[PDB]
Amino acid sequence: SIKKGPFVDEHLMKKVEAQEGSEKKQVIKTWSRRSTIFPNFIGHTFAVYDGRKHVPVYVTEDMVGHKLGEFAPTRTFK
Amino acid sequence: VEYRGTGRRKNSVARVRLVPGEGNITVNNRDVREYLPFESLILDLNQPFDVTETKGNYDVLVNVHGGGFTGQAQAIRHGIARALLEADPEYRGSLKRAGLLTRDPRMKERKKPGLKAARRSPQFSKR
Amino acid sequence: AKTSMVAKQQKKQKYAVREYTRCERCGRPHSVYRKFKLCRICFRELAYKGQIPGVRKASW
């Protein structure tokens, strides 16, 4: 957490910034659990895990300032 | 006539001179009574002066270096005995009757490897 | 599976600080040095028999 550009991974930006044209919904196929939320995000899911999961996570208007796609957990407890 | 009384106690050298007159001890351009910081027993390094049957023999205006503070002290007590015996060489047979002039018994020692405080051992659990 | 790893390490996988330091005549990845590039048991048989310089035994 510093100044200077909260570090969206750039190929994800390449997908979204021209993906937002029409009214279609084909979401991510990313498994890059690093990037934050740019505010210009459209209604779409994601796939943010790579061992075995593509958890479709909602882009809904949460606290978008979190520097994480951390809505998808990794393990269980009980 | 007394000069060059070195004095060593616990990694803290001290070099002195002795000037005749009266007893007025001083180190490092400042006093003694309000330099030895806790040390209310400043008089108990002047105590070879007690046992040489004469207190106000000479003035010192001594020097000291290194160590702690009572490690930096208590060698002045050693350091004026060498130059004190060099002021008059009679005193070896009459200052070593209380056993005072020179002994360097102890310094700190090595932390022994795989221990914690150079004689202590770590606690072993059970049986 | 370590002779592949030495084949990785002298090459470069291009980021800045992804590399690490490995033993010269041995191949351990932990407890190596930087004064010698050897490692903590592979240093010892090369510190003995006089062949490395500098090294008296001990006990200062």
Binding site: - | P37, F38, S40, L41, D44 | -
Partner: protein, 155 residues
């Protein structure tokens, strides 16, 4: 030590009070290597004696050790094929060294909320009897003096 008689060689002079037996109880109140907080508290606990007692603490002090002075010891010894105690009278060098602990151990027990005043109520009320620590020396003073037993035991 199975080898005999480690030497003693301990020295204890003093700045003003002119007493070897006062630099001993500076060497037992001093915990954790801080001699730099002992006589600042000790001599500020003896100059407050004459403001609390009737006299100077010097002529009260030998009385204060004199009434706390322990007499008899019970060092247990399994005699000859049995097991019960024996009274031993203490050799005079050991007995003050046994004696001085009862000032400080009950100095940390009197809730006067100031240690240089809580500790000094056992030098006052020590030349005068029934203090804090005189109770233990009368408790162990009659431990085997009244309970006299096999007194032909060696150790």
């Amino acid at each position: 030590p199975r080898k005999g008689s480690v030497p003693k060689r301990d020295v204890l002079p003093d700045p003003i009070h002119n007493s070897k037996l006062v630099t001993k109880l500076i060497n037992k109140i001093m915990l954790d290597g801080k001699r730099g907080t002992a006589q600042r508290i000790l001599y500020s606990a003896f100059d407050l004696v004459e403001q609390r007692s009737g006299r100077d603490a010097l002529e009260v002090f030998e009385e204060a050790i004199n009434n706390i002075m322990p007499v008899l010891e019970v060092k247990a010894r399994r005699v000859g094929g049995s097991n019960y105690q024996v009274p031993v009278e203490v050799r005079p060098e050991r007995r003050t060294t046994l004696g001085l602990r009862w000032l400080v151990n009950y100095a940390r027990l009197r809730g006067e909320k100031t240690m240089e005043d809580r500790l000094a109520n056992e030098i006052l009320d020590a030349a005068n009897n029934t203090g804090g620590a005189v109770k233990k020396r009368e408790d162990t003073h009659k431990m085997a003096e009244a309970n006299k037993a096999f007194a032909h035991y060696r150790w």
